[PDB]
Design a protein around this ligand. Structure first.
Ligand SMILES: CN(C)CC[C@H](CSc1ccccc1)Nc1ccc(S(=O)(=O)NC2=NS(=O)(=O)c3cc(N4CCN(Cc5ccccc5-c5ccc(Cl)cc5)CC4)ccc32)cc1[N+](=O)[O-]
Length: 138
């Protein structure tokens, strides 16, 4: 699947939920629902994430890199991948909320690059997005 597309569609959805309009199908829908489910379950972790970002134009890239290293420190699995998308979502929402919308394109780029460089192999070795969909889709 095309990672850039997966990222852009995810980001658009998270921003829309917060009242912002930003400018294979079963994969996007399944990922969406798992992300909503993640943020519902880990309610406090989700709620508290935005307040720990301290975004600035020059630190955002490093904040992203720091949280993502921690997230995947013990290895990759589908749950952590969903949390990774949810984290990117929180970053984008916080960016737009703090009048730093130009960060959104950058974040989308960092997510895409992390997918391509660091998650692609695990994903292919574990059945691809099709296997994700089989586990957590309807
Ligand atoms: C059909 N549908 C109803 C199935 C739903 C089911 C439960 S909801 C869910 C969804 C995704 C992930 C976790 C729960 N889905 C489901 C269930 C289990 C697994 S799993 O066994 O493969 N993996 C996991 N099972 S779990 O114990 O619930 C869990 C928890 C978890 N996290 C990692 C992140 N951590 C906080 C954190 C720590 C360090 C850095 C950053 C953060 C962070 C904070 C805020 C935000 Cl915004 C983003 C990141 C909170 C705990 C990561 C993986 C798993 C995968 C899925 N799935 O993919 O849908």
């Amino acid at each position: 699947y095309d990672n850039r597309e997966i990222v852009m569609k995810y980001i658009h959805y998270k921003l829309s939920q917060r009242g912002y309009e930003w400018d294979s199908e079963v994969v996007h829908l399944t990922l969406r629902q798992a992300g909503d489910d993640f943020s519902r379950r880990y309610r406090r972790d989700f709620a508290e994430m935005s307040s720990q970002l301290h975004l600035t134009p020059f630190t955002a890239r490093g904040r992203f890199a720091t949280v993502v290293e921690e997230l995947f420190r013990d290895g990759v699995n589908w749950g952590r991948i969903v949390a990774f998308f949810e984290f990117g979502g929180v970053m984008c929402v916080e960016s737009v909320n703090r009048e730093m919308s130009p960060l959104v394109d950058n974040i989308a780029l960092w997510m895409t690059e992390y997918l391509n460089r660091h998650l692609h192999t695990w994903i292919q070795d574990n059945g691809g997005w099709d296997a994700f969909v089989e586990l957590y889709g309807p």
